[PDB]
Amino acid sequence: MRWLYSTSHKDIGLLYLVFAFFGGLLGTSLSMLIRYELALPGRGLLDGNGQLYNVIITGHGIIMLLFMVMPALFGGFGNWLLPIMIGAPDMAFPRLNNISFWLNPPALALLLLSTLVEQGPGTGWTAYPPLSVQHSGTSVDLAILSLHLNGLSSILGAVNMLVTVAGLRAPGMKLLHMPLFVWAIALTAVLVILAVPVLAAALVMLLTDRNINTAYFCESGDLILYQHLFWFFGHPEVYILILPAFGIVSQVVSFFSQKPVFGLTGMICAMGAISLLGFIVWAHHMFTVGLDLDTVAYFTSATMIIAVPTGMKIFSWMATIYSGRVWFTTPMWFAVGFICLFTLGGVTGVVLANAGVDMLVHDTYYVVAHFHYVLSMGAVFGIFAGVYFWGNLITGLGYHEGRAMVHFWLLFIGVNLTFFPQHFLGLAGMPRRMFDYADCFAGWNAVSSFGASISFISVIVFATTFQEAVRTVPRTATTLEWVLLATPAHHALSQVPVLRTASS
Amino acid sequence: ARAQIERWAAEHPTAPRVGRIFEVPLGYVVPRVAAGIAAAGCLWYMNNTFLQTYRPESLSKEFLEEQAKIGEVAQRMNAPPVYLNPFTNRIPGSILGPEDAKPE
Amino acid sequence: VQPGQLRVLEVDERLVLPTNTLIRLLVTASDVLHSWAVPALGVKMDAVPGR
Amino acid sequence: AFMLYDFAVGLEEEHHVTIPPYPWMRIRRLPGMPWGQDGLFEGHPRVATTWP
Amino acid sequence: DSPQPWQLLFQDTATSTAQAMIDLHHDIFFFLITVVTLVFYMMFQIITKFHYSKVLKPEKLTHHTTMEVIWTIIPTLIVVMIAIP
Amino acid sequence: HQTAKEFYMEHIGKRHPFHVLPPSPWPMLAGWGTYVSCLGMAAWFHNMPTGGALMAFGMANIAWTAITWWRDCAIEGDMGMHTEVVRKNFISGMWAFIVSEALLFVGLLWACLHLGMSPSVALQMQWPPVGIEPIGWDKRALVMSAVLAASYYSANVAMVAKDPKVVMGALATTIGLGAMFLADQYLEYNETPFTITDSPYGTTFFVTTGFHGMHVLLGSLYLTAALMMYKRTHNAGAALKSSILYWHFVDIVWIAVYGIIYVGQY
Amino acid sequence: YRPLGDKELWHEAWMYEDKFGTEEDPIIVPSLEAERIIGVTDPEDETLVVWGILKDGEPPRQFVENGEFYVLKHVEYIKKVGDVLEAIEG
Amino acid sequence: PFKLPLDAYILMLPITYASAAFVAMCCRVPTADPETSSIAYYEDEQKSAAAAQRYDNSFKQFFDARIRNHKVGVFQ
Amino acid sequence: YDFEHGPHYLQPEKIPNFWSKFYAGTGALYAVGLGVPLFAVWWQQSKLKA
Amino acid sequence: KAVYAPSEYFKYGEGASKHFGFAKHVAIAMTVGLGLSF
Numbered sequence A: 001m002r003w004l005y006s007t008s009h010k011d012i013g014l015l016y017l018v019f020a021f022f023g024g025l026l027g028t029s030l031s032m033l034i035r036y037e038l039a040l041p042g043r044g045l046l047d048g049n050g051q052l053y054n055v056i057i058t059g060h061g062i063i064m065l066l067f068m069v070m071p072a073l074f075g076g077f078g079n080w081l082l083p084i085m086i087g088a089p090d091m092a093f094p095r096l097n098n099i100s101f102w103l104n105p106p107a108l109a110l111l112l113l114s115t116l117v118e119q120g121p122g123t124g125w126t127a128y129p130p131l132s133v134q135h136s137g138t139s140v141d142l143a144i145l146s147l148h149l150n151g152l153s154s155i156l157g158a159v160n161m162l163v164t165v166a167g168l169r170a171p172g173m174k175l176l177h178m179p180l181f182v183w184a185i186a187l188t189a190v191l192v193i194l195a196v197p198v199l200a201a202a203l204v205m206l207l208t209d210r211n212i213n214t215a216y217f218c219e220s221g222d223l224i225l226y227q228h229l230f231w232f233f234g235h236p237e238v239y240i241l242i243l244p245a246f247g248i249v250s251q252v253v254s255f256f257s258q259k260p261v262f263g264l265t266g267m268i269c270a271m272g273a274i275s276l277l278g279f280i281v282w283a284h285h286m287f288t289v290g291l292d293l294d295t296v297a298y299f300t301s302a303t304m305i306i307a308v309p310t311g312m313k314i315f316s317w318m319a320t321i322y323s324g325r326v327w328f329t330t331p332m333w334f335a336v337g338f339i340c341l342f343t344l345g346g347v348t349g350v351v352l353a354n355a356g357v358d359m360l361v362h363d364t365y366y367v368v369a370h371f372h373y374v375l376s377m378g379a380v381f382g383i384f385a386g387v388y389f390w391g392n393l394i395t396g397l398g399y400h401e402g403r404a405m406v407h408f409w410l411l412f413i414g415v416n417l418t419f420f421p422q423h424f425l426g427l428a429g430m431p432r433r434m435f436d437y438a439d440c441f442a443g444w445n446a447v448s449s450f451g452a453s454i455s456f457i458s459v460i461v462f463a464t465t466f467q468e469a470v471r472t473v474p475r476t477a478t479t480l481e482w483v484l485l486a487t488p489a490h491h492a493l494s495q496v497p498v499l500r501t502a503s504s
Numbered sequence B: 001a002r003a004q005i006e007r008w009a010a011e012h013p014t015a016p017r018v019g020r021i022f023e024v025p026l027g028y029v030v031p032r033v034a035a036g037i038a039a040a041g042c043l044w045y046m047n048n049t050f051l052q053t054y055r056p057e058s059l060s061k062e063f064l065e066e067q068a069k070i071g072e073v074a075q076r077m078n079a080p081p082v083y084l085n086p087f088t089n090r091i092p093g094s095i096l097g098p099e100d101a102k103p104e
Numbered sequence C: 001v002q003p004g005q006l007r008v009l010e011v012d013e014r015l016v017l018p019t020n021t022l023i024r025l026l027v028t029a030s031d032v033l034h035s036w037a038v039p040a041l042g043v044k045m046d047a048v049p050g051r
Numbered sequence D: 001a002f003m004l005y006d007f008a009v010g011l012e013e014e015h016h017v018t019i020p021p022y023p024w025m026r027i028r029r030l031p032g033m034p035w036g037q038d039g040l041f042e043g044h045p046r047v048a049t050t051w052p
Numbered sequence E: 001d002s003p004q005p006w007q008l009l010f011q012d013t014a015t016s017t018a019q020a021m022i023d024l025h026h027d028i029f030f031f032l033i034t035v036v037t038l039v040f041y042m043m044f045q046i047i048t049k050f051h052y053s054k055v056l057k058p059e060k061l062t063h064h065t066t067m068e069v070i071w072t073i074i075p076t077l078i079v080v081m082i083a084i085p
Numbered sequence F: 001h002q003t004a005k006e007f008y009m010e011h012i013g014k015r016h017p018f019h020v021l022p023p024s025p026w027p028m029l030a031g032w033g034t035y036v037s038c039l040g041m042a043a044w045f046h047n048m049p050t051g052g053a054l055m056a057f058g059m060a061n062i063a064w065t066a067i068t069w070w071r072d073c074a075i076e077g078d079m080g081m082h083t084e085v086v087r088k089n090f091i092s093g094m095w096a097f098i099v100s101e102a103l104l105f106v107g108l109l110w111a112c113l114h115l116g117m118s119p120s121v122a123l124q125m126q127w128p129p130v131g132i133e134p135i136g137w138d139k140r141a142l143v144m145s146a147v148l149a150a151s152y153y154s155a156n157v158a159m160v161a162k163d164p165k166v167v168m169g170a171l172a173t174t175i176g177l178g179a180m181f182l183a184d185q186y187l188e189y190n191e192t193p194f195t196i197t198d199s200p201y202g203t204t205f206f207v208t209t210g211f212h213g214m215h216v217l218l219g220s221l222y223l224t225a226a227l228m229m230y231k232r233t234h235n236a237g238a239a240l241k242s243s244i245l246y247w248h249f250v251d252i253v254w255i256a257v258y259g260i261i262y263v264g265q266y
Numbered sequence G: 001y002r003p004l005g006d007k008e009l010w011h012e013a014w015m016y017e018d019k020f021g022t023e024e025d026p027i028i029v030p031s032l033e034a035e036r037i038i039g040v041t042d043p044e045d046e047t048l049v050v051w052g053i054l055k056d057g058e059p060p061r062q063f064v065e066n067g068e069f070y071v072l073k074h075v076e077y078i079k080k081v082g083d084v085l086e087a088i089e090g
Numbered sequence H: 001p002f003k004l005p006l007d008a009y010i011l012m013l014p015i016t017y018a019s020a021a022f023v024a025m026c027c028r029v030p031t032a033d034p035e036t037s038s039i040a041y042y043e044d045e046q047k048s049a050a051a052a053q054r055y056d057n058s059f060k061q062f063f064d065a066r067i068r069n070h071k072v073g074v075f076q
Numbered sequence I: 001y002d003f004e005h006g007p008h009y010l011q012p013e014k015i016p017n018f019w020s021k022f023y024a025g026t027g028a029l030y031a032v033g034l035g036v037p038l039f040a041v042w043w044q045q046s047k048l049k050a
Numbered sequence J: 001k002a003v004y005a006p007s008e009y010f011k012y013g014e015g016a017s018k019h020f021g022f023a024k025h026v027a028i029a030m031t032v033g034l035g036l037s038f
């Protein structure tokens, strides 16, 4: 009854964290079938089924995108940490926060049920027509309705987050004293509210094309219109999944350096510039569909601008570590690893922005290596940095430092050996979304499938890190959740704290 | 900024503070990651050995030796054969194919 | 396939194109989306039903 | 006043303008409709059958 | 023409357009190498020189307007140098 | 129970002006109602027998859960749990929901602008397609625009009035004017010489006007629910203001809908 | 008391006191419980926040360097300044 | 809220450039060739060809003198 | 323990047999999350093999 | 006798960055990167 009828933010955030762990387990299971079909030339364990391989990659991409990183960063750490960090007693709409969580298990259930109906939804996670429309049966409708339910969940969560930050701050605390995780969650909520309904409209058009015999994307329609609407949604979507990671990395790096964050207003402005530029660059996913050269020209020139705010954020993190008193712990290694390895994920994005180069590497494994650098090593490292940072506060359990270092090194080795060879495959022209490849692509495919098993082993080793905790008493901190007891009370902040400005 | 550091170091007593960059000793970390890498290698080997339903005939040693006899040469239905990828294999521009070369 | 040929990549009927000549290629499709990609020539354009 | 005038000049006028079956008219990618044969709210189908 | 085993970079070309694309890619990679080298070397030196066994207590450094303007203005020049080709 | 109010005053009410809720069963029931209705909708698309009844069953359960949730919210308002800052937060949440619905309509009208502006060879590059007789602006649609502008002004009356009879009469006039916008859209949907299956023009027209009509119906029901709370205690608070805000949003949406579809023939 | 213009009437002043708490004259923080979290900014930097915990029956305590001293006092009512004492306007 | 630092206006120069370019690209599309709702637009061959070549040459004519000189790379 | 009004909303050292149920729940979570895709593979391939 | 807050930071320049040589390390990094790029 506690975990079904909750109105507290700390319980709903923990429910999000557990649901995100379940989604990560499902996606990791779906990702071993991909790398085990792709280990050797010919036909592997899927018995030469291409529809089943397409179903597997569709389900894997949708699950790891929407049901793992999004509920962990936005719904998980955001719901637990936002009202404590700003000093709010609760969320603004506590029963809306519960339906924000409780629309996610119906969506995941519909997505998993679509795999068992007819031949499944083998379309890719983008679901381009007329491939989505040609599929006889019911599975594609279930997958798109799963997408609708997840989108409505994210919209309602963003509504609650935006009213909470605006209207329930502590007295004396303006929008200058909030830590950078709060700013990241607020800008993420703004992006969600602006971008998700475009996807909802596009999927409504897809439903009417599939089932109502309409003419949105058909013989007499326009198939480029779907790609326009979908990528206008989908490129803000990948900055929704990465800004809370920036906030977490700011909090972690600031903590263990014994220093405040370098260039606070520059950090906020860089996050805002990233948020604003994400809505006008979306047709960098559509360089090969046959657009006019002026459109291609503008979207090439505009996409390269996003590098400058990100470079300022990275150099500001490095200046935060600079001239400090740094103690390297397990969450600290997950943030230094973030800084060193998100750079490798962004430099290839610069290459992909230039449309002349993108004529060669569109829909190859160069793209895949890029977006597994920025997601499996930017967002996953951000998720795991906060688990070893706030875990004793959130769950009450400590962790063994040695097994956590074992888990970190296993994950770090297993991801640098899975996707670094996928660059060379894509430069040599190996296409995406294929299970049988040419005989000369065998060596890097073997190395990548070797790396995936190391990744799976590090997934297994993570379950053995938890242990009992030691509880102490706080006196002072720089953020408001490190003066609370571990775990805090059900109504944390019994008295609402105020921020007093001194005579200076 | 120091007090939250000292509080986190008390709630996480297994994390050592001894004065070195890698605080956990490598004698603990290296054998366990080696064992994990070995288990991953065993899973990869099991997939390669026992989980294939069709091995291609173009990877048999007879096909491979007969291909290595030919080299990187492509046939044409309207022309003499041509050396594939002439820049990386350093074919000079005068030579177009095997048969058109007719070695001196 | 037979030795000297490439597995997966080989077709039965090729496309014959002269060199040193300006060629117009009109790419389209009949049922779903496709893409005509030849990485040696630097050409990759999507085949869209109607375009 | 004009809407109350409109409510009395409603379903009384008729159109007999039959439309030939053009490729963009009466799309039937899936046979029929989920509720029947004709469209919803459609009591007087216009596109012609038996196209001479 | 056709891909090769253990291949790193692009295939060989038969048009001037594709060779122009590959040359643009290598020109971008010229800048990327220097960016990654600077980031990795500075991260290593910051990690080694500011460990707590070396540092008695940290320094207060929240802002530096000159360095902020410098690392804002240098990558924008690189962006516009890349964009025109 | 008698000390539950005492405990609330001792620990929550006298310490901060924000509202802390007791545990509630309605979010979970609404989520699994969405699950049931999605299964019914997917079965009803492909003419599976007893699929439309299942979709109606799931929608009826969602409607009942939402009605009981909103009755609980109204009860909590009547017992004085909401201060002024809570009501300001209610209007802020309504503004965020309005922004989301606005971007939904922006994505919907993007399709009208794209498909109408550059007709394709499949249409023999003629917009509007031959056979299609488009709906004119010089007719019943202009009467609809007049009625909905009158509804805008009458809803604007009830926002500023202080006499309760004026507020009730203005709200009833706004609701009755909204009901005439929908009863006449039904007449357009019956007299129109095309279908949603006839060309992208008919497709975009019916989908966009249907979404607008659904929003008109939701706003009319929300204004009706805000009036009965005022008919009882002569006080509505955030229920009156947010319903007026939503109604003004619907009015502004009709300007874009009329000026893109009816005037621009897109 | 600091100027109460542009201050919300329920912010419970003592935070808006016109005093710099010294060792020999601390700022008395009222509280409904024996402990309370308060937040003090750096006197040389508005952007930096240190949150501390004051306890009932303790000596004066300074949170930031060169900052105010504080003493907690357990009370049954906290003056919700904005309609408690400026309506008095004494 | 706070005072924007000196970086954010160096940020705002290419951001304003990108926003202006986006507005211009959106504006110049309904004043182009294929955005005509008739087959009778192309029966006037002089005006159609003139409008289409005007749409061709704009923003390309700033690049013709370096297209002809193979300025397609940072280095040569 | 009193989760609503006690000092901690989660007291994991006071559930009886906590470390047994915790490992049982973790094992069940790993089992379901790693075995649901394999059941979906088995289900589709058993329909073609008919 | 009251509870005093401790001195928590040095001023930038007299702690452990006086012996770092920031510009020297940036010059070394740019030299190595430019050598590899060339």
Ligand code: HEA
Binding pocket: A017, A020, A021, A024, A025, A027, A028, A031, A034, A035, A057, A058, A060, A061, A062, A064, A065, A068, A069, A072, A123, A124, A125, A126, A368, A372, A375, A376, A380, A383, A387, A411, A415, A418, A432, A433, A434, A448, A452, A455, A456, A459
């Ligand atoms: C969230 C993004 C994300 C992540 C993390 C991953 C992780 C991995 N992915 Fe990929 N992948 C995609 C996003 C991601 N992927 C997308 C979008 C596609 C395209 C689908 C389509 O085309 O439709 C794709 C497709 C894709 C391909 C291309 C297949 C094809 O082209 O057909 C390959 C090939 O190697 C691959 C492999 C892997 C491997 C070995 C990992 C490894 O990293 C394994 C995972 C290991 C982890 C450690 C991550 C799990 C994380 C947790 C368990 C943390 C949870 C913890 C808490 C919540 C506390 N996946």
Ligand code: HEA
Binding pocket: A238, A239, A241, A242, A284, A285, A303, A304, A306, A307, A308, A310, A311, A312, A314, A342, A343, A345, A346, A347, A348, A349, A350, A352, A353, A354, A358, A361, A362, A363, A367, A370, A371, A374, A375, A378, A379, E035, E039, E075, E078, E079
């Ligand atoms: C975590 C999510 C995430 C993030 C943050 C990014 C970030 C970026 N991405 Fe990407 N991207 C994806 C997720 C993401 N992407 C996904 C999922 C796809 C495939 C979708 C699909 O089809 O399935 C994709 C594909 C994709 C494409 C389309 C290619 C194609 O599919 O054909 C492009 C093209 O422009 C692109 C570019 C960029 C750029 C320029 C950034 C920039 O934001 C990166 C900026 C960072 C840096 C540039 C490094 C830091 C900068 C410095 C250290 C300063 C030095 C820099 C310079 C001097 C320039 N990525």
Ligand SMILES: [Cu+2]
Binding pocket: A234, A235, A238, A284, A285
């Ligand atoms: Cu993108």
Ligand SMILES: [Mg+2]
Binding pocket: A362, A363
């Ligand atoms: Mg593509």
